[PDB]
Amino acid sequence: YITCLFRGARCRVYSGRSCCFGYYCRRDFPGSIFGTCSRRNF
């Protein structure tokens, strides 16, 4: 249960802990409150 948000999970803007290392949380569309975790870009 104790872990970070990994790829394939839901996450909102005002969610709790941030996403895992190398992964952030993006929104769904212009004017949304919830989104999903995606892999970073390099």
Query: Domains plus CATH for the chain?
Result: 1-42 (4.10.40.20)
**Gap between the Cα atoms of 6 and 19, Å rounded:** 7
Residue carrying structure tokens 């569309």: 29
- Rounded to a whole number, what is the distance in angstroms from the first to the last CA of the chain? 30
Q: Which H or E run includes 37?
A: strand 34-39
Token pair for residue 42? 């390099």
Method: NMR
Shortest CA distance to 11 belongs to which of 31, 26, 32? 26
Shortest CA distance to 37 belongs to which of 28, 25, 29, 27? 25
**Contacts by 23-30, CB closer than 8 A, 24 or more apart:** none
Give me the torsion for CA of 41, 15, 34, 9, rounded to 10°: 60
- DSSP letters of 1-42? ----B-SS-EEETT-SS-B-TTEEEEESSTT-SEEEEEE---
CB 4 within 8 A of CB 17: yes
